[PDB]
Ligand binder design. Structure first.
Ligand SMILES: [Zn+2]
Lengths: 100, 54, 64, 195
RNA sequence: UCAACGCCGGGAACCUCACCGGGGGCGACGGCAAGGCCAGGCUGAAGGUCUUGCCGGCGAGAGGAGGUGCAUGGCCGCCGUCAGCUCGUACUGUGAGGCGUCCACUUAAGUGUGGUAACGAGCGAGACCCGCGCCCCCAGUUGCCAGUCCUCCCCGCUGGGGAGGAGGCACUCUGGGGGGACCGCCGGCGAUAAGCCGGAGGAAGGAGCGGGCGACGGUAGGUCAGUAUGCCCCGAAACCCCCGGGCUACACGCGCGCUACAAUGGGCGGGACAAUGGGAUCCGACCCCGAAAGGGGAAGGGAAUCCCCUAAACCCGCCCUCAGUUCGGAUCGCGGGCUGCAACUCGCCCGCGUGAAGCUGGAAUCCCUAGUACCCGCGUGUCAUCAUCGCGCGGCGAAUACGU
């Protein structure tokens, strides 16, 4: 039985923080871990017009919200679960765990 | 007797989507659950985290 | 335009004022010395400074 | 979905921030930080004068903790009020203070010079203030005061400069106030130091 | 006028709405019962008001898609991604003011090199941020399948070719970090400088390519019908909620486009080959109905796992052979469908018929320098239903000039 953990965030530094924390968690003990694996970055694009009126040449603002995604597999041992679940996650990162 | 002042429960149409901030009806970006107008979004986007990045 | 900025030329001349022999007629050696001496985190700026220092060394060793 | 909940929570946060910026205009409103937890959601409110918030009476804190749930639908919310340091480097607090000064009836040139002096005395490399409206007569005008160094355009502009805007509702119209400040620990790309 | 006219994200059936025809509701606070319902009348329909009974115990103000963009703020277009706007000390002038900021060369640039009663500083330009292209390290699932092994199927000649599973991450791809290009090397020009034109190797040459950020000011440029806001106004209403119409009305003038006038083609039947993006009462494979539009079940997917998605132009063969035609599709009749509370005014699709102008276009005028222009089709925004539109994606792919 193995455990998979998915990380999503807008900030890369927090991602690296959590991933290196769990990497040390898994290296102190001898356990097999794959990754972290980078998934395609997802962008929410929104193009809109600047002027609040209709007069004048048309001009457009293009806003983007980027989301980076990492995947990890941890082999799901008791010690690993114990000393992993006890890590304060920075609020700018979402993390979801589940066993295969 | 006091009900001739209330709207109807629209499910579709332009009268079914007001802006959470101003109250406009027509132009709603409506992308990813954004019930904001094209005038207020362009002003509150950085507060939400959007950037230009072109 | 391949025009070097005033601050590029000024920093090059200031670094040739002192440390006059740390530099030579090789762009790579000058790159190394620049990165070791000053805190510049732009490859383009650093490379332009190194090229100007190279030209200065050539001009000096030949005269003017 | 995940991103839908994401964006909806962000939008509600923005709405609450606007409401509080309108309500706490006197205390000095600097910012907000909402943190949800099984312990119970909590709201960190930055201010330069927490007296106008929790001074000798909890009526305001009770009213706020009730409104945040009766209007914006926040579950089991609590509120912590925090004091701001370096208020003379935030461009929103200073804008609102200048607007309130103008509303008191104090002359705009004097008030702006005083604010510039006070911001220069407490550490800063640059300040620019722009006033606009019916300062003198029926026709509107604009006025600008400056002192120090600034970075009007560019990425260092968008990052290292603090900005604020405010409205002054006077007896005969609205005056627009815009302030921009540069902190003392800011360094631009074109300055390189030698060993 | 540029800088209005597929603009107000303005693709309006109701709503949107601000217009027309009608109906009904609205007075916190200050002083001198309110209200609610079975049946039937009035009524487009209405305990809306009436018959019947019975339950229940005047100022001022909110609001205003009403006036004033020539009372304002904020935000946008154009001078203009132009190269300009200033300060300190000194000097020349009675003074307003000047110099610096001028001259020569150079640059995309008030960018630089020299000379100068000027010597030095600041905001703008550049630096900065994003992406594309070549290389190295790390990582190997939901992404990849080359060599390895173990099964199954089929052909021609035992040579081959396919589909799985084990197992790999090598190649592709994805995304974090780092190197690489600097007129650096060699020549001529410029003056010996600042720089310019050529060769070399190179993935890439001369700010590599394409974008974002747009200065002091000024335009009484546009917006009070995106929100905020003074003054005036309506306040029994110009406030706000339903029911029907209109913005879709058409002798005409104009702008921006689509389809065409055919062979550098039309039709029929076969053969190929993308990318960007999106997806919960949403995308929907798979199976069965129906000639088509469409209808009934239903796996998987909260999306590197499933779906939208075997794109068109292009190639092959057959018919047509210069003709108002097998060119062209307007307009109209009959019938069958989907969305929606409601398709007449006023929606989209399908089949059979019908078959209007149009034979390359005067004066005049427009966009374009490289994977660019022409040509071809897909995504998304608006969306219950509706794209000849906007914003983007790829496929095929030039001709000329390196000037004035
Ligand atoms: Zn709004």
């Amino acid at each position: 039985q193995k455990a998979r953990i998915k990380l999503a965030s807008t900030n890369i530094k927090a991602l690296n923080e959590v991933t290196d924390q769990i990497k040390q968690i898994a290296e102190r003990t001898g356990v097999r871990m794959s990754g972290p694996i980078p998934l395609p970055t997802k962008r929410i694009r929104i193009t809109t017009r600047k002027s609040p009126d209709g007069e004048g040449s048309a001009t457009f603002d293009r806003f983007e919200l980027r989301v980076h995604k990492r995947l990890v597999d941890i082999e799901a041992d008791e010690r690993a679960m114990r000393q992993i679940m006890r890590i304060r996650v920075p609020e700018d990162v979402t993390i979801e765990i589940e066993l295969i | 007797k006091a009900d001739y002042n209330k709207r109807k429960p629209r499910k579709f149409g332009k009268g079914a989507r007001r802006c959470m901030r101003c109250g406009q009806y027509g132009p709603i970006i409506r992308i990813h659950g954004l019930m904001l107008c094209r005038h207020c979004f362009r002003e509150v986007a950085p507060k939400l985290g959007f950037k230009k990045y072109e | 335009g391949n025009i070097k900025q005033t601050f590029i030329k000024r920093t090059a001349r200031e670094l040739f004022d002192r440390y006059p022999d740390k530099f030579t007629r090789d762009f790579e050696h000058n790159k190394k010395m620049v990165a070791e001496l000053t805190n510049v985190t732009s490859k383009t700026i650093r490379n332009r400074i190194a090229g100007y220092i190279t030209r200065l060394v050539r001009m000096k060793e030949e005269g003017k | 979905a995940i991103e839908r909940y994401f964006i909806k929570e962000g939008v509600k946060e923005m709405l609450i921030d606007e409401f509080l910026e309108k309500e706490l205009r006197r205390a000095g409103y600097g910012g907000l930080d909402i943190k949800k937890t099984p312990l119970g959601t909590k709201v960190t409110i930055f201010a330069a004068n927490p007296g106008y918030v929790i001074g000798r009476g909890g009526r305001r804190i009770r009213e706020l903790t009730r409104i945040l749930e009766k209007q914006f639908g926040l579950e089991n919310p609590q509120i912590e009020v925090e004091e701001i340091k370096n208020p003379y480097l935030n461009a929103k607090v200073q804008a609102v203070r200048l607007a309130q000064a103008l509303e008191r009836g104090i002359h705009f040139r004097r008030a702006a010079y005083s604010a510039i002096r006070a911001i220069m005395r407490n550490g800063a490399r640059g300040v620019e203030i722009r006033l606009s409206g019916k300062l003198t007569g029926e026709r509107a005008k604009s006025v600008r005061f400056y002192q120090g160094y600034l970075a009007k355009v560019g990425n260092p502009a968008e990052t290292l400069v603090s900005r604020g805007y405010a409205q002054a509702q006077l007896k005969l119209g609205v005056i627009g106030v815009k302030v921009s400040i540069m902190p003392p620990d800011a360094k631009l790309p074109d300055e390189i130091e030698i060993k």
